[PDB]
Paper text:
3-Hydroxy-3-methylglutaryl coenzyme A reductase (HMGCR) is a polytopic, endoplasmic reticulum (ER)-localized glycoprotein that catalyzes a rate-limiting step in synthesis of cholesterol and essential nonsterol isoprenoids such as farnesyl pyrophosphate and geranylgeranyl pyrophosphate (GGpp). Whereas Insigs accelerate the ERAD of HMGCR, another protein called UBIAD1 (UbiA prenyltransferase domain-containing protein-1) binds to and stabilizes the enzyme. Here, we determined cryogenic electron microscopy (cryo-EM) structures of HMGCR bound to SCD-associated UBIAD1 (N102S). The interface between UBIAD1 and HMGCR occupies an area of ~1000 Å2; the complex is maintained by several interactions between TMs 2 and 4 of UBIAD1 and TMs 5 and 7 of HMGCR.
The structure of the HMGCRTM-UBIAD1-BRILN102S-Fab15B2 complex was determined by cryo-EM at a resolution of 3.3-Å. HMGCRTM-UBIAD1-BRILN102S-Fab15B2 complex existed as either a monomeric or dimeric heterotrimer. Interestingly, within the dimeric structure of the HMGCRTM-UBIAD1-BRILN102S-Fab15B2 heterotrimer, each HMGCRTM in the complex existed in a different conformational state. The structure of one state, designated UBIAD1-HMGCR complex 2a, was determined at a resolution similar to that of complex 1. Further analysis of the resolved structure revealed that HMGCRTM adopts two distinct conformations designated Conformation A and Conformation B. HMGCRTM assumes Conformation B in UBIAD1-HMGCR complex 2a. TM2 is tilted 45° in the membrane and TM4 forms an intact α-helix. In the dimeric state of complex 2a, Conformation B becomes stabilized through direct interactions between TMs of HMGCR. Comparing the structure of HMGCR to that of Scap and other SSD-containing proteins led us to speculate that when HMGCR adopts Conformation B, the SSD cannot bind to Insigs and resists ERAD.
Numbering used by the authors:
A (entry chain C): 264 to 383
B (entry chain B): 41 to 112, 122 to 300, 309 to 338
C (entry chain H): 20 to 137
D (entry chain L): 20 to 125
E (entry chain A): 0 to 35, 60 to 223, 231 to 275
């Protein structure tokens, strides 16, 4: 289940990114970004297949945790910003979330899942 | 040297090779032993080599389709070294089959029927199906290669043909299919971008997952039925169900290992079975 | 004895297309690949691409993907290369090269050069 | 596109003296190197395939060595028939890339 | 290079005199029959069913020309006629039921190689050109098809010496079907193609054909060698099993 779970999570996350970038009203923005936060926290407990042999208190693991902390921070910022109805700044922050995910988290999770596929 | 051409010789193998080629032979000989009570090593080695050689020749028929694009051993390969090795393997197969005729007490017609109908039947349709549908043609091969190898080995051993080995050889065909499907699912996007089509691409990801799980878990139902209804001593392959659950939770090396162990326990089940307690045995 | 007899010099104008021939003879033509190599002025070799003579499935180097198209003539034992949209930087030798007979050999049999002049 | 580099550009020697070239790759390419020899107005001809294995029809003075990344060809004693350009080719990952080329001098 | 010359000769000599070859061969068939009306009923039923499954499974009018279907139909009629006449007249009438799955499938299969030659022929412009195109098409498609027919006939042939009666009969029908297909394809299919194209020039399939035919039609070199070894092995099996047994 983990492979398909991670891929579904990642694909739906990307779909939600498309939704937030092409959203008009604040309501869909809100519920979409809450889904993003939910997908993020569901992906938190998912361990990276690179870091199975090593201990769960590794510097690379800590980098991954800091990364995710920054992600949820940005999402929370977007929530509190978009609560009133600020869409353009929410999309801007979302795009910055897209930059930082592509910087760290995407680069991690894509090569992460591949190892699991190699195992099976 | 030999080690410098071992890389050339590993070109005709696949992750599902040991199972699909060599497990049937051991099963067939186990059935022959249970039925008649006398096993022959010479015929066993001959059947093993003959089935393995034919399978290798077919794998090279597929390997030649990786020259269309640069899919490609620690040497420079080109389309003479594959053809020569295919010819050599198949000739080795035919020489082994001729030896088996001379040694065994089976009729030449039945031996020729099995060996040129079943084992070498893949060559009649494969080749000229294109490079895209090479993976789709493999399913039919692995469905019709598992049971026929068992029966080939059984018939050569005993000295007369029989229908039940095809019935006893269903679980191995299913587990082998699970290996092939798993390995196809592993290369979904690469095959999609390259232009190659497989079953996993056609049916989609969720259906490939349920198909994987079906093909993985059917053998255990068959072993539980064959245990509780024929002979209780055959229930060994249910002992490896934790590995099957681990495989299902982590979704081809581990699948291949699982198949190997399933096959081993199934053979140990067949051998340990009481006399007269097995259908048509 | 294998020998790869290649065509003579080609004095051409800019913007045109040019066709080269490397008549393979002395072996089973349809068994081995037919690679091509470029040697520019300054003497720095570059790999263009290959062609399977049986099918015709080519496989180019990315740089020469647009302006080099390899074709084959199984009947007369001849491998062709067509250069298109020539510029000042295509004045160079072109070799047709093939691997040795046995497995594990490197590229023994080279042609003789077609001195293209733009 | 593995970049292969070579380290005397022009290499002056005397007849009898031992020579040594170097083909320093940009990646671990195993034993996949080929040393060609090209004299004035001719086609390159193979000397040492796979960094060690000799070729039939080549004099015994040509010998190679090395593995991984750094390779080396050597000539025991040079004559008037060893004045040429030497190119190293890798056959590890497509597309194959030749070296710069080392010319000799008396 | 040796065989291609011989098949080119054959293709040219057949296509040059279509009517005489077609009437001569039909005469030979009816002579073989008469020397020793359900044939028509079985021909029609079998033709319709086979032609319909081919007509469906292949995308109808995908290229934009119905001559291919007409030629395929005219191939199927002759193949089914030559098969049916032997089955009805000679072998056994009462024993032809429910085991006509193999002959039914082999013709579906052999239709592709008949359609190929039609595509080779249709790309022509002139009469001498279409005759030359049939000759070259025959020279390219002859050897491979001969080998395929030979190996299939020998494998299904060795199927007829098992002992199981149902298998013996099914395999016998398989062998007759293969030989009928090959006989019709070689003898009076190119005559029919040539005559149809001669007696009727809106046939525009030149560029695609002349780029892809000599590349896409090529089989797998490993398969061909294995088939030759199979053929040789089966010839030894048959020789021994029929004469020395
Ligand atoms: C006592 C037993 C023993 C065993 C057994 O039973 C009794 O005997 C055997 C018996 O003898 C049977 C065989 C006999 C008849 C059959 C022959 C058939 O062979 C195929 O072999 C191809 C050889 O090249 C030819 O068609 C291809 O050849 C070229 C056409 O001239 C194209 O190059 C190619 O590919 C094309 O396909 C896609 C695009 O159109 C093209 O870009 C592409 O070039 C075509 O492919 C064809 O392949 C078929 C499927 O294989 C399709 O139906 C057909 O449509 C399709 O165009 C054509 O000869 C045929 O198609 C194969 O299909 C199944 C087959 C072997 C049968 C299967 C089951 C068995 C083995 C039976 C069985 C185990
Ligand atoms: C991919 C196809 C192609 C080829 C093919 O299979 C798949 O291979 C053959 C395979 O081998 C099969 C045989 C397997 C074993 C079977 C055995 C049995 O034959 C009888 O043979 C007697 C011999 O003495 C026995 O006594 C008797 O006990 C037994 O009953 C008969 O009942 C059917 C049988 C011959 C089967 C009929 C159909 C096939 C021939 C199959 C068929 C053409
Ligand atoms: C799988 C395909 C290729 C079919 C197999 C082909 C057979 C028809 C061939 C292969 C080996 C042949 C021979 C096997 C052994 C001999 C013994 C020979 O006489 C001897 O006693 C000498 C043997 C010895 O002691 O060396 C006479 C021919 C015969 C029966 C041959 C009969 C025909 C055989 C079985
Ligand atoms: C399974 C086997 C029996 C089929 C393989 C044989 C045939 C498909 C082909 C191969 C070459 C053919 C040709 C061999 C020589 C003759 C004579 C030859 O001379 C003529 O009839 C006209 C004079 C002329 O050629 O100019 C023309 C071709 C022909 C009819 C062909 C007859 C059929 C042959 C034997
Ligand atoms: C049929 C009886 C009554 C007369 C006996 C004649 C045969 C012993 C000979 C005549 C011509 C022969 C050949 C006809 C055509 C060839 C093609 C030849 O080569 C190929 O198949 C080329 C394949 C490729 O190019 O990929 C293989 C042998 C074969 C089938 C031969 C089979 C044996 C044949 C029919
Ligand atoms: C060498 C070349 C020309 C390849 C073709 C060889 C085949 C035409 C031969 C080899 C053994 C033959 C026989 C195999 C078994 C059948 C069924 C058997 O029963 C009947 O068909 C009886 C009714 C009848 O008289 O036709 C008699 C021989 C027959 C027709 C033959 C069919 C054709 C076979 C396969
Ligand atoms: C082209 C494909 C899709 C369909 C062709 C498949 C057949 C060539 C094969 C597949 C399995 C075969 C066998 C299936 C089981 C039966 C019953 C079996 O048992 C008996 O009837 C005993 C007879 C006796 O020995 O007395 C004998 C073989 C037979 C007739 C065979 C008939 C032909 C079959 C259907
Ligand atoms: C089922 C097996 C045996 C397949 C092998 C294919 C042959 C049956 C084919 C290949 C060449 C064919 C033809 C060879 C040349 C002629 C032309 C034609 O002869 C004439 O009457 C022309 C008279 C003239 O012009 O002088 C009649 C058919 C015939 C005998 C054909 C008969 C069938 C043949 C022998």
């Amino acid at each position: 289940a983990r492979r398909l779970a991670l891929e579904d999570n990642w694909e739906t996350l990307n779909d939600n990114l498309k939704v937030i970038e092409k959203a008009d009203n604040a309501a869909q923005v809100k519920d979409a970004l809450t889904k993003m936060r939910a997908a993020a926290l569901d992906a938190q407990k998912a361990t990276p297949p690179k870091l199975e042999d090593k201990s769960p208190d590794s510097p690379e693991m800590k980098d991954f945790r800091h990364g995710f902390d920054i992600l949820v921070g940005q999402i929370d910022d977007a929530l509190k910003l978009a609560n009133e109805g600020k869409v353009k700044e929410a999309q801007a922050a979302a795009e910055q979330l897209k930059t930082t995910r592509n910087a760290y988290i995407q680069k991690y999770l894509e090569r992460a899942r591949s190892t699991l596929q190699k195992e099976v | 040297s030999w080690r410098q051409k071992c890389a050339s010789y590993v070109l005709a193998l696949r992750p599902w090779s040991f199972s699909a080629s060599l497990t049937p032979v051991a099963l067939g000989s186990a059935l022959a032993y249970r039925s008649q009570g006398v096993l022959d090593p010479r015929l066993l080695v001959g059947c093993a080599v003959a089935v393995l050689a034919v399978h290798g020749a077919g794998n090279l028929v597929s390997t030649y389709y990786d020259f269309s694009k640069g899919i490609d051993v620690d040497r420079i390969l080109e389309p003479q070294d594959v053809v020569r090795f295919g010819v050599f393997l198949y000739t080795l197969g035919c020489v082994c089959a001729a030896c088996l005729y001379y040694l065994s007490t089976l009729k030449l017609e039945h031996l020729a029927l099995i060996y040129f109908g079943g084992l070498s039947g893949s060559f009649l349709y494969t080749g000229g199906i294109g490079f895209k549908y090479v993976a789709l043609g493999d399913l039919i091969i692995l469905i019709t290669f598992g049971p026929l190898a068992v029966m080939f080995a059984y018939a050569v051993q005993v000295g007369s043909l029989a229908i039940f080995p095809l019935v006893y050889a269903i679980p191995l065909a299913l587990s082998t299919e699970a290996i092939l499907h798993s390995n196809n699912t592993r290369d979904m996007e690469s095959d999609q971008e390259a232009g190659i089509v497989t079953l996993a691409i056609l049916i989609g990801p969720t259906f490939s997952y349920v198909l994987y799980n079906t093909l993985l878990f059917l053998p255990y139902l068959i072993f539980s039925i064959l245990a509780t209804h024929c002979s209780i001593s055959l229930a060994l392959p249910l002992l490896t169900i934790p590995m099957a659950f681990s495989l299902e939770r982590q979704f081809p090396q581990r699948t291949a290992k699982l198949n190997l162990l399933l096959g081993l326990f199934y053979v140990f089940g067949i051998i340990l079975a009481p006399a007269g307690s097995l259908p048509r045995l | 004895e294998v020998q790869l007899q290649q065509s003579g010099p080609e004095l051409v104008k800019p913007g045109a297309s040019v066709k080269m021939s490397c008549k393979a003879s002395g072996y089973s033509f349809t068994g081995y690949f037919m690679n091509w190599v470029k040697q520019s002025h300054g003497k720095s070799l570059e790999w263009i691409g290959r062609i399977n003579p049986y099918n015709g499935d080519t496989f180019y180097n990315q740089k020469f993907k647009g302006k080099a198209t390899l074709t084959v003539d199984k009947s007369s034992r001849t491998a062709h290369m067509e250069l298109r949209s020539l510029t000042s930087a295509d004045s160079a030798l072109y070799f047709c090269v093939r691997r040795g007979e046995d497995y594990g050999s490197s590229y023994n049999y080279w042609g003789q050069g077609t001195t293209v002049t733009v | 596109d593995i970049l292969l580099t070579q380290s005397p550009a022009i290499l002056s020697v005397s007849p009898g003296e031992r020579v040594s070239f170097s083909c320093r790759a940009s990646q671990s390419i195993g034993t996949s190197i080929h040393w060609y020899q090209q004299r004035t107005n001719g086609s390159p001809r193979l000397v040492i395939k796979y960094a060690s294995e000799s070729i039939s029809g080549i004099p015994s003075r040509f010998s190679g060595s090395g593995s991984g990344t750094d390779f080396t060809l050597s000539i025991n004693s040079v004559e008037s028939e060893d004045i040429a350009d030497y190119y190293c080719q890798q056959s590890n990952s497509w597309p194959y890339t030749f070296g710069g080329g080392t010319k000799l001098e008396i | 290079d040796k065989l291609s010359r011989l098949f080119r000769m054959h293709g040219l000599f057949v296509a040059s005199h279509p009517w005489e070859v077609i009437v001569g061969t039909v005469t030979l068939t009816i002579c073989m029959m008469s020397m020793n009306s359900d044939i028509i009923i079985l021909t029609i039923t079998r033709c319709i069913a086979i032609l319909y499954i081919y007509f469906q499974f292949q995308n109808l009018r995908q290229l934009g020309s119905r001559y291919i279907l007409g030629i395929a139909g005219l191939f199927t009629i002759f193949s089914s006629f030559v098969f049916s006449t032997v089955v009805i007249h000679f072998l056994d009438k009462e024993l032809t039921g429910l085991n006509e799955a193999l002959p039914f499938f082999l013709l579906l299969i052999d239709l592709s190689r008949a359609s190929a030659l039609a595509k080779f022929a249709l790309s022509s412009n002139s009469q001498d050109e279409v005759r030359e195109n049939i000759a070259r098409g025959m020279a390219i498609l002859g050897p491979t098809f001969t080998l395929d027919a030979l190996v299939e006939c020998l494998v299904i042939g060795v199927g007829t010496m098992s002992g199981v009666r149902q298998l013996e009969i099914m395999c016998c029908f398989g062998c007759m079907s293969v030989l009928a297909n090959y006989f019709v394809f070689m003898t009076f299919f190119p005559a029919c193609v040539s005559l149809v194209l001669e007696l009727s020039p809106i046939w525009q399939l030149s560029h695609f054909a002349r780029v892809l035919e000599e590349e896409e039609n090529r089989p797998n070199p490993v398969t061909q060698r294995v088939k030759m070894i199979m053929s040789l092995g089966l010839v030894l099996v048959h020789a021994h099993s029929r004469w020395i047994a």
